[PDB]
Every structure is written in structure tokens, then in C-alpha cells.
Amino acid sequence: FIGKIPIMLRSTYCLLNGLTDRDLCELNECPLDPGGYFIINGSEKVLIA
Amino acid sequence: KRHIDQLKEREYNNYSWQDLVASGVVEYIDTLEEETVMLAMTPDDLQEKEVAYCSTYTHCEIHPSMILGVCASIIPFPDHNQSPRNTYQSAMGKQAMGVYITNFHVRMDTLAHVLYYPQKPLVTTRSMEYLRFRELPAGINSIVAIASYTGYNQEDSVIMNRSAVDRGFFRSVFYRSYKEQESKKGFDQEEVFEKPTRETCQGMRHAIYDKLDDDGLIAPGVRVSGDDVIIGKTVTLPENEDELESTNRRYTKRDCSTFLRTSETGIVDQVMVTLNQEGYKFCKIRVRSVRIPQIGDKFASRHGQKGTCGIQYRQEDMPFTCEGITPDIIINPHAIPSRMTIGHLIECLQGKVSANKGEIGDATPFNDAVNVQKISNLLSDYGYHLRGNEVLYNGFTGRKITSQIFIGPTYYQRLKHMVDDKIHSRARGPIQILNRQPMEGRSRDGGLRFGEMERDCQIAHGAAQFLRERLFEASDPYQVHVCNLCGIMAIANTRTHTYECRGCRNKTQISLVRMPYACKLLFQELMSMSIAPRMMSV
Amino acid sequence: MPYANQPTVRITELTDENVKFIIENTDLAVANSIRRVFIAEVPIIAIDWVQIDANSSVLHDEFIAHRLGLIPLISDDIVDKLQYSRDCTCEEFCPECSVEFTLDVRCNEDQTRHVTSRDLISNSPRVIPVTSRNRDNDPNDYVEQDDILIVKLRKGQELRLRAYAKKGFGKEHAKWNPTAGVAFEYDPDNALRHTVYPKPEEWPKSEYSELDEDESQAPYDPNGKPERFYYNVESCGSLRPETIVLSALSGLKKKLSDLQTQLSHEIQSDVLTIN
Amino acid sequence: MNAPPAFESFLLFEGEKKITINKDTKVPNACLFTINKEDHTLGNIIKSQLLKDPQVLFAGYKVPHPLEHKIIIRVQTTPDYSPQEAFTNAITDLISELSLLEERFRVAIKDKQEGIE
Amino acid sequence: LDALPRVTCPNHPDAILVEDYRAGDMICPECGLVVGDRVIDVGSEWRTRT
Amino acid sequence: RDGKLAKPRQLHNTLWGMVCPAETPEGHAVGLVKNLALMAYISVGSQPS
Amino acid sequence: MIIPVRCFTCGKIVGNKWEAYLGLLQAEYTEGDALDALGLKRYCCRRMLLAHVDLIEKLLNYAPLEK
Amino acid sequence: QPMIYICGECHTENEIKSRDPIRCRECGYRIMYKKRTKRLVVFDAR
Amino acid sequence: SLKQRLKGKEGRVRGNLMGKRVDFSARTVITPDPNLSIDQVGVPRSIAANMTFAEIVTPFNIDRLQELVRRGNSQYPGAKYIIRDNGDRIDLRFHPKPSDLHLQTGYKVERHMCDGDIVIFNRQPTLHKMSMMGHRVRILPWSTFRLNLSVTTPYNADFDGDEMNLHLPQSLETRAEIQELAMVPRMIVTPQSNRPVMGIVQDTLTAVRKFTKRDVFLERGEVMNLLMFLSTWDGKVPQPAILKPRPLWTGKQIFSLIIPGHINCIRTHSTHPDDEDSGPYKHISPGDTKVVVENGELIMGILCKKSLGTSAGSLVHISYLEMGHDITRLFYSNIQTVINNWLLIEGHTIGIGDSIADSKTYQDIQNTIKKAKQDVIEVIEKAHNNELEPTPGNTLRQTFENQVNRILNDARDKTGSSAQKSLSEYNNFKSMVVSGAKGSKINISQVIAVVGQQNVEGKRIPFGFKHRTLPHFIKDDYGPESRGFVENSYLAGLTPTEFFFHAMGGREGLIDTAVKTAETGYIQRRLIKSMESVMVKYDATVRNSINQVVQLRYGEDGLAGESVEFQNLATLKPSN
Ligand SMILES: [Mg+2]
Ligand SMILES: [Mg+2]
Ligand SMILES: [Zn+2]
Ligand SMILES: [Zn+2]
Ligand SMILES: [Zn+2]
Ligand SMILES: [Zn+2]
Ligand SMILES: [Zn+2]
Known about the structure:
The structure is cut from a larger assembly and holds 9 protein chains of 7 kinds.
Chain A: H1 21-26, E1 38-40, E2 43-45
Antiparallel strand pairs in A: 1-2
Chain D: E1 19-23, E2 30-36, H1 40-52, E3 56-62, E4 70-77, H2 83-110
Antiparallel strand pairs in D: 1-2, 2-4, 3-4
Chain E: E1 18-20, E2 25-27
Antiparallel strand pairs in E: 1-2
Bound molecules: magnesium ion (2 copies) and zinc ion (5 copies).
One magnesium ion (MG) binds near residues 156, 158 and 162 of chain I.
């Protein structure tokens, strides 16, 4: 074990990426919330280009 | 055109955009490649040979709107509007209040503003569908009449219908989520969530824990205000140094119970308890509050014409049409031409006819639709003045107004500018004895700033005594005793008997001076540097 | 006074939802003011007290409560009979100044259940309740006369609440306004030239213009005076429009009589004498 | 709210009075009356009602502020004719006309229990 | 002037000295009170090689 | 940062179709702050070998 | 969202004519005929309904709206 | 007060006056919910 | 660091003395109120509930003062605290018998802030002496400050969301000090440029133009209605302007009623009308195009701003001189009230109709552009032939770029002049432009006809796209569009390319504005720190803080700049 890597939302590893909207609402997730930004200590974080 | 049919086939079966990429009828292009390519503006006109100054075109734009960003894409016909207004809209669009997702209930952000009755734009750009804007609108298309009225709409404001406010005009919920954690405060010292009584604890200053539950937390649905204790917890400190009887029920139970800042009022929305990576037990509570439009609150048009509510009137007081239609908003005419925002009129003109048509118009800046006359000709067809101008009856005398009025629907923004959060005042309260300056600000009930330039004006004013009241009396007042033998401030001063100036053996020749306390501190600071400044009237 | 208008009256058309009529021989100030009376002045009953006992639905109580306001209660039971709760010197409220309402719903069914005004009942003595298949044992319903869908409930959602309807009028809040937009017209030919109408062809003709139908682009008279006001009252459903007008007419008279009594009181309270 | 309740627009406080009566201190047979919790809506017909009277030398009114609920009326009539009578005459005439308007309305509505055709 | 702690007045020995954080004032109710001094409020200051 | 003064912000013409010209804050960061075009895309890097 | 009764511009009720409209749409793909059938002869009322949108069903789409 | 914890995920009241470490029966999750207030609450229809 | 603590870097100097916080102050967003007198300021009740004044008890008002104590904190017309002669203060909220509580003359009572009180109001940022003025309070609903429009003028405030700051003095010296100096009425004329600072604007200015129209006629009923709006009036109804066929009053008659009755302002109609310098002399039907008022009675002349204020020869400046600030402020408040009420009933709007011009002229304008387009091509081909003659002292390119620029300017001006002709006087836009409000002919060109050439630092758009601006253009292109010329109108819309060039220039204005905004604060600071060392002395000589003489007398006369005025000496008359 080398570490715990923070992952971008809607990543390939964000397993929710395959789930339907219906699945996402089943998860209480927003289907129009694609993410693409990390969640750090429960806070949403976006990289600026 | 058959490839389009393939794109149509994709809705059911398959025909990927990548296949379209694989089709090689379109390619993806960088700026270096752009330097060499002969780009075309449009498929139609450029293929013409009759006036072919060039025909060496190599590639063509999908659509000129593709230059546009998320914000610019929202406002129709930006080219009929002054260019910066769009940048102002692009910023102000970001400033607007609105919905943002679907599951607001699971969400418990520190701050949120959501509209009761949002509306998709009566005039829309097709791309906004891809922006899912019609799914998540952030304003409504209100029907507005352009008129100066009483001048209360002058300079970046508007008069609005109070009676419309009664129907639920732009009313919104405000949600604030509070979070609070329990944790150690030393080897033994720690916070302890509870509902302490006034005699079983200290540090309670004066506030009561009635709202609390035995757990120390307020119940969900409870009415709240900006003073009471929102979360109850207390921390005993020495456990042994208190010893022997100065017991009391308060013991060493020092208060650390969380209370609400002296401003907010409302009802408890939600309460959630859990634990984190730190492991410490913590709770999160959401508080619901309601935002209603009020005089002075900031609002905005979709065309970057922001304005505050200058005032609100009942529907009866408002001037009205042949039907008696009172507009939702009364905007000052003059604000448009100076800014040259013709597009603002086009939303209204397109919106008017679309409403009459009962059908949505596209808001793409580039068309062959001939929006000027054809719409105007069409506006005449629904049985209206072809230019949109219409006579209205007086709200008070009922008489027909001398001028004719351009009236119609328009997408409007409620901006993130709670004026009641912007106000701030104080006459007396907590200070900062370290400098004797007022508290930092409103969230600590502080005084208001005084700047170098107000001083500069005040000198230019010549009213030294008001500055003196302001610099001394309204901020930093002090009394000092000095030895007559030396301008050095040295006294022991039995503040009920003797004064004396040690080192000078002064016994009676004491004198009193008025200076700022912060200034005396600076002077003491000079003495710490071994400087002995002194001062006399002689 | 030696002379006054005869306030000519003519009624053109009436329904339970609207009334169209023409008033003549009267001042324009009277026409607008009475028009202002039609909206604000008419007293009505509306909910002022709501307790929500339970709500497992998605919406928050205050949303529904605002909606409870938005409910168009019919006023066809002389709602004026109830004393004002303020003046009724009763502990906050009473049946002499309040009606009571209660709503309890639970979605045990798996499919989405819809909630309606019918789920809300007048616990107080059956003064005519919300307009939802109560007036209409009439084979003339709109489609169902389910007038308002309160909310929808997926399986598992519940709603328990109580309400108090109280006396009020449009000026207090629009929810107490028993009227929608009020139609009004005088002098379509613009003989008074209250506005220019440049190129009258750019101005389509009004239905009243038709009577003075004309192809002379707008006849003119400098000596003219506002006359033949055309009315069409649009009731919101809360009451029959003509009946709204009478209550409006009665109220304005009463409003004036009290001022005269006060005017007598001004001269009584004063040292002035008149006779 | 940092603003008064809606009933305060028309409802008077126990220390308030609906109207206040003052004599003019500038010209003879004139007075200025102040009406509280009221608007131009009342004001305009009464001005007109007084204007209809030829015995009136002067009549006029205004709110002190639109946000405020109060009006003031200045009136001057012939030296033999008091401004109080003009206001009294104007209101009694106006109320009377309203009653007939109502009665003709009643006659007009009543005049079609079925249909006019 | 050592009798500070939390209770004294010139007319009576104070029995109670409430701290009004809101206005940042010290009040002694049973006579009228302004024992003076709000030190900057602890209820304002309750959010705070070898 | 590196390379300052006599350089400023205005606009470059190649930005056409690359960035929305209107999409910028009205603060001092104006023009200093840019925003992605509607259909612009970014190279991820590959091996030409 | 959740069709507010009474058109803000006038006051025309529509507390059940949304679904009826939606019914009208399923029955007739003519908004004009739908809009007309509803009785919204005024376009202010038409704008009310035409520009209305109801996401609640998506909110309903969730399962967990149980607690 | 019988109130005091309606777990989030099992969606069930724990319901006691306890200083337990925010635990929950069957459902090991710590996410807790607190019952609606047992108080008189007036609402206006404005 | 002990030196640092002092040093100024948030030290005792800059971080404390140069800027700190104060009490008895409030700041909110601003809202408009033309109904307010120029001294009034609208004030939130909560602020008024927050604000208080500690009055010293006098036997003349002690009973009332006691009522405020008795009324206490529980209502606005009450008092929060009382401060006794010996220094003792009492909280009336916790006092056991607030009403029964004893009090005497010489005690101080902290009562709530009341209306009619004088406060000092400020802009932030503060730029001049009118930026801080004494004001009269007005207690109102909602947490908004309401102000007279014309008070916005020296403030330059915007209701887009500006906050400004107010301070309430607690001393009678200062109350006098604010009243005798800080009060706005004295602030009317600026000594910086011996001109007035007040200015009636926008709606008010437009309706005034509208009001001066010859076609303005009034009814007796409305005259009474107008008369009541008057803040002051003689009580004596004026004679009708017309008797037959029916009695009537003119707006000029009624405007002249507003005017004080023994002062006149002449010579500056300052409107485009009539003609420049000799046409109106063309017989002297002196006409409605020139302004003239006698004995407080307007003879003729559509009004302008140069008449209305903030300029030389203005009515406002002379009224200030004769009638004084106090009479002029009441006249000004009164006129705004009247014009507002007339405007309210008269009404004013704007629409696409206002953008409508004549098709044929509009057809001629495009064809004028077509000839100019053709004119550019003639210039391009000659240069390509190298047969084009370079301007002396300039390169051929400098000539070429200059030559194309004259054409793009002449054509746009010509086509603009067609649009100035093409618009009726009936138009709101022409009405708005003429009145002296926020508009002009160039606007008409931009909205109706043509925006014109876009440029970079005054130069045509550079070839950033490799000897090109865009790949839509051919290489070596020199078309005006290829260099930023916006030929279309705001009504016509913009091409994708023109919009971009239009967007670019908008940046230039905006960037310059942001940079200019920061720098002025800094430059001023450099300026103030220098000039603070000097003041006028009683011997008329100008001196510094060390009493050394700067001037024999201030401005070499010792007189006030405000009392100075623009005059012609005319002794430099040509022929001896
Ligand atoms: Mg500004
Ligand atoms: Mg402004
Ligand atoms: Zn000494
Ligand atoms: Zn009762
Ligand atoms: Zn005491
Ligand atoms: Zn409607
Ligand atoms: Zn569980």
C-alpha cells in the first residue's frame, strides 16, 4: 500500500459514471451534476487552468 | 444530407460523433493549422461563384455562435447590444440567484438561494438546451413597460408591482447550514454537548438554553433568532485547581455553547449528526430562511441592465392598458439608449409576439428571419400596433397617457445582493481596548470604517472640531496626568486620593491632559525604545 | 348640490366568471376609483392561520402555506357576516371570525398520489368551502372541478396540517382580491386626443371602436368629454362578478359615510359652528 | 421586516384621527384640511366635486408623500360661503349619486333575469 | 475599588450584573445600572537547531 | 509574473473561436481572466515516434 | 414548477390545467389548440403556462425521498 | 424526551436520551436525524 | 518587531491613525426619491431604532424628555438610556420602573434618533468637498437610503448597488458646525471651477424640454392640481393665458410661476435648433429656439442643461447669488416635484419605432456606403500599382491608412447626417438627445446606421493572424472589415467578425477604467500629502504650517473663487 489518491468526479474510477440518472437519484445523486472536481474534506474543489 | 439521416439514426441505433470524426467530413483544428487554412464563414454564400473574390476556402465554421461562452450564449442578439453590457451580464449572470441541481434536500451548503417559480426563457438560444438551462432556469420572463413614471426608477433601478409580490413575485428560500464539532481541549479538557442551566454553568453571559434539548441541540422546526444559543456545550478546565468549595453548580463548567450571530431570524430546517476522518463526533444543522423582494434589493435584466427595486406599488396605483394590464416592472427608458441596448427591446418584441403566437422564438443572433418588419407585421396580425408601442391608462386619474408605451415580456435576474446583509451601523458597543478601536465589523457588531480620504475631505472641510469629535470622541477618548516638572506622563494616581509623579517627587503639581488612548500607547512604545518625549503648553 | 351626473348604467354581458357592461354619464375619476374599488376594497375570507402537524412530502411547509394563501376560496356565503378577529375580541380567533380547516394525507399506494383542495376540509360550520365539486353538483364542470392539485405524493409521503380562514380584503393582500384583470374602455376614436396615435392605421381597431366604426383614421372633437365607459369585470372565481360589483358599490358608499360622520365629528370636536 | 404591516396603510392608531381641520392663515374664507390614512383616489373626485361648485375660489389636495398615507386639502370659497359647506355639500351630493348608480345598476342587472333577446 | 468581581453600586451593593452582549452593555437592573466598562466582550470574544 | 510592464492584456486575434471575448470578470482581473470557448478542446499529448 | 394558481399578470387560475394541457398535448400536438382549449385567451396567461416547467417528477425519480 | 435520532440510512428513530456514540441499531451508519419539534407553530398563508 | 509595530505597515500610523472605525455611523445601499427635499435623506427605522442621541435635560422639554424615558426602548419615540450629571448611566430596558424613574435638569438622556436631525453624509470613495455633506434625516420603511436625484449629482451615486456612508454628530457645536458648513445648500457652487455642482437630469431634464414645447396647454382643473404640488405658492391664482374660444394656461406661464419673481437668466438656449450664429438673427422672430426670461417670466426658449446648471451662464448660479442657497433649494425641490408630477401624467417611453427612419434615406445610406466601399477599392488599386502619391513628410502606407480613414469617416458622417435628418422631432430618442440627456447623433449612427471603424490605439486592427486578422479573410486583405470597421448598425446587428472587434475595444475602455480607478486613489495621496501643509491666514497672506508666507494674498486678491464669474471685458475692441 502506497497511498490514497483523491479522484476527480465522473472519473473512469468514479463507478457512478456508468449508473443511470435513475441509479443516481437512487443514490440521491444529481444526474445533471457531472462533477469533474475533487471533494476535499467534504468541500468541492476545482482546478483553474 | 444522408449523413444527417445517420445522425438521426443515432437517436435510436448508432452513429457516433466519433464516426462523424471517423467520417473525416469534419476535423479538429488548432491555431497553427488555422494560420494556413482558408476558413469559410458560411457554406451557402461562399460557395457562390458569381462574386467569388476567393473560392480557395478549405474549411468552414459549424456556427459563429461557437465562439461564445456559457454566459454570452444566454443573451439573444448581443450584437444589437453594446459589447461591454454583455461582459457585465456575463459577470452579473454569475451574480444572479437561482437553482443549481436537483437534490437540494440532501444538499446542506452554508448558503443557498432558490426561486419558487423559475421560468425557462421565452426567447431561447438553442445551445441553452445543451446547457440544460431550460431544465434549470434562473429567472422568469416578466412583462415590463418602459416608462420613467415618478423617477423612482431613475439610475439603475425599477418600480415593481407590490400586488404581484403578493402573488409570489420572485420570492425565494434561503438556506444556511450550520455545522458544529465536539473535540478534546487537552489531555483531559474537552467540549461537552449539553443543556446547562444558568446556575450549573458560567460564561453564559445572559443567554438562556430553553431552545436546547438535553443533548444540547435545538429541535428541528424550531423558530430561531439572532441571539439564542443554537448548540449547547460546556468545558470544565482545571478539575483540581478550583478545589475546596468555590464549588458552585457552575464549578469550572465554562461555556462554549454555540449561539447565532446577532442578525439572523428564522426557523430550523434540518439536523444531522455524524463522524469524520478526525474521528471526533460532529453535527450539521440546516436553517431555513425566506427571501422576498424588497425596495432597494438588486435585480437585473437578461441584457446586463441591472437595477434595484426603487419602490413597490399596489396594482391599482399602477398605470394600465386597454385591458388594464399593469406591467410587472417599470423601467426608465433613458437607461437603454445611453447604454445602447437595442437587444433588450428585441427580447420584448420577440417575446410579445411569441406569447401571442403561443410559441417560442429562437435567440440566435444570426438569422435570415428578418426579425424587424416580419415580426412587426406579425404583431399587427395578432391585433396590435406593429411597433409594439401601446397606449395605457393612468393608475390614478385613469386618463390615457399622452405618450404611447412599448410593453412586453422579459427574462429577469434576481441578483445575489441581499441589501439587508449590506447595511451596517452602530452608535455604541464592544470596542478593541488593545487599541480602543471599534470591533472589526457587523458580525461582531462593530463600528464603521473611517478612511484617509474622509479625513482629507474633513481637512478640506475645515470642520476640525467634527474630526476631533470623530477621531477623539467617536473613537478614542483619553485623560492623562502629567508632572508639571516634566512633560513625561508619570503618575501612580490614587484614583480617589493622591496622584504624584515618582522620579520627580511631585506631590501637587499634577496636570490633566486629553489625548487618544491609542496615541498614549504609541508614546509608551517610544519610551520602550528609550525615548523620552515630553509636551507642554509652554 | 344643484346638479350631479345621472350615472347612466347599461349591462352588456354577464357570467359567473365575468361581467361586461357600459356605464355612462359619469366622471373618469369615479370610473377609475370604483375600478380600484373592484380589486382592493372588497372584503373576503382567506386563511391566516396554518399549523402543519406532519409532512413527509418533499416540499417544505412554508411553500404549501404560501400556496394555501394561493387557494381561491369562493366567497358565496356572505363572508361579510363574520366579525373581524381583531374586533371580535376573541382569544386570537373564533368561528364568529374564523373558519377552521384540516388536511391529513398519507401515500401508502405505490404509485404517485395527488393531493387536492378536497383533502382540506372546513372543520368550522360549512360556510361554502373551496370550489371543488361543491358548487357543481352541476353537469357543467370544467373537466373535473378539481380546481387545485395541492401536491403529489410518491409512496411513503404524508401530510398533516390545520388551517384557519379569516376575514380580509384585496388591499390587505392580493389573495383577498376577488378579481383578476379589470377591462375598461372609453372613447376609442380618440376624439379627446389623449394620445397622438400617429398614423392611425398602425393602430388596430378596438371592439368598441367598431361602434363608432370609422375609416377616417380617428375623428376629433376638442369640446369632448370622457363618456360611455365600457366595462368587463373578470372575477377570479371567488364570487360572481356582478355581485362583487354591488358589494364594491356598497363598501365605497359605507367608506364615504364614515368620513362624513367623521366630518361631522371634525366640526363637532371643533369650536366651529354651522347652524 | 424594516417596514410596517399592510393594515397600517389604512388602519389608524388610537392616537390618530382620520382627518384634521385647519383654517388658512393666508387668505380669507379659506382652510386647509388634513386627512390621514387616505389617498388621491378619494381626493380627486372631491376636488372635482368642489370644482363643479362655482362658489369655490380655490380647491386642491396632495399626499405629503406617496409612501405616506395622508392627504391635505386647501379650499377657498366666496366670503359668504364657507369651505366647510362646500366639502359637506360635495360629499352629500356624491354619496347621493352613488346610491342612484347602485339602484340603476340593480335595475340594469335585474333587467335580464333571462335574456334581452 | 477592589470590590469589583461582579457586583457593586454607589447606592447599593449590586445583587446581579447582567451582560448584554447584543448592545455590549453591562446592566444592573434593580436600580437602573450602567456599572460602566464593557471590556471588549467575552461573548464577542467567545468566537475566539536545538 | 515573468515578463512584466509594456505587455498588458487587450486581445489576440487567434483567440477567435478559442475563447469567449465577453466572458470575463469586471474586476481588475479583467482580460487577465479567460474562459473556454463553447467547442474548444485541449491536446492531451501523444508519441509521434 | 408546481403551476402557481392565478396568472401573475392577471390572476387567471390554472391549478389543474397544466396536466390537462399535458393531456391536451398527448391528445393534440397543437399548442395553439391546447392553449386555446384551456381558455387562456390572454398571452400573459399563455406565457405563464408556455414557459412553465416541472422538474419535480425528476425529484420524484429518487427513491430515498423516504426520510 | 422520546425524541433523539432517526438514523439517516435505515431511516429509523433510535429515540432515547443517551450519550451513546451516535450509534444505530442494525444500520451501522452514524448519520442521524432528529424528529420534528413538538411545539405549537402558527403559519400565515401570506 | 517593535519598530514595525509602530512603523506604519498596519502600524500605529497607517493601521490606526490614518484609518480606523467610528460609532454613530451607518451605511446601506442607495435608492432614489425625487420627492425628498435636497436636505432630506431617507433613513431605515431599524437604523433609527439603532441610532440614538444623548440630550442634556432642560426644564423647557424635561417633561417630554421624561416621556421618552417613560416610553423607553419599547418603542421608537422613546429613550434607551439616561446619563446623570455625576456620570451615572441607566438602562431603561432593565430598569424596574422606567416611567417612575426620577430625572432632573442637567442629566443626559440617550433618546432614539428623530427626524429633522442633521447628519453628515459621504460617498466612499471621497474625492472632493461636496463628497461629504450635512443632511436632514427622513425615517422610513425598508433598510434603504432614499435621496433626491439632484443630490446624486455631486455624489455621482448609482443605484446599481452603491453604498455610501453617514455620520451623526453628538455635539451641538458640531451640529451647528455641520449646519453652518457641511449642509448641502452651501455646496451648490464649486470654487474649483467657479461653477454650480447641482444638476437636474434624465427624466426631469427630458420632461422640461417636453414642457417648453409651444404645443403645451393646460386646463384650469389641472392648474389647481399643479398648484397643490407646489412646495410654496402665493395663494393667488394667476390669470389664464387664453380666454377665447376657451380659457387656458401655458406651460411657460406655469414654469414661470415656479420661477422666483424678480430675477432673470438670458442668452443660453444652448440647443441645436434655429442655427449657428446668424440664421436666428435672420429677422428676429427671436423664436422658440432661444431662451429668454423676464421678471421671473419665461418669454420663449426650449431649456437645456447649460441653462439648468453645472455650467457658466446658468440660472442656478445667479439664483444662488441673488436668492441665496435657501430660496434656491426650495425652488429646486419644488420644480423637481412639479416636473415629476407632470412627467408622471404626461408620461414618456421608448421603442423600436424610435429606431425607425425613412427607407429611401436608409436605402440611400447603404448606397452611400457602397460608393465608399468602391472609393476604398480605388485607393487600394492605385497603391498596388505603386502609382499612389505618398503625403509629404509621410510614408505611402501612412498616407494610405490615413486616406482610407478619411473615407470611412466622411461616409459614416454623411450617412449619420442622413439619419439625423431622417428622424422626426416626435421621436423620444431625438427628444432625449436634444434635452441634453444621455445621448447624441453618433449614437443614432451606431444604433440606426453604422458603428464605424474599430481601432487599436487609433490604428486599424493589426494583422495578428499572419498578415491577416482572421482565416475568413484572404491574405493581404485590406478591407475595412479586415481591419475592424463595423459597417452595420445596432439595429442591423453585427457580423461575427465585427462583434469580436467590438468586444476588443470594450476591453480597452474597461481595462483603462480599472487601471484609472486604482491610480487616481494613489496619485491623490501623493498630492494631498504635499498640499496639506498650507492654509489661508487672517492677514490675507497665504502661509504654511511653519507660518512662512506662500503668497501676499490668496490668488493675489484674497477673494472667494465662487464669487468669480465669466465676463467679457470687450475693451480689446478692434478699431480704436
Ligand atoms: Mg456610481
Ligand atoms: Mg447614476
Ligand atoms: Zn515628573
Ligand atoms: Zn372572534
Ligand atoms: Zn444597582
Ligand atoms: Zn394572465
Ligand atoms: Zn441506521
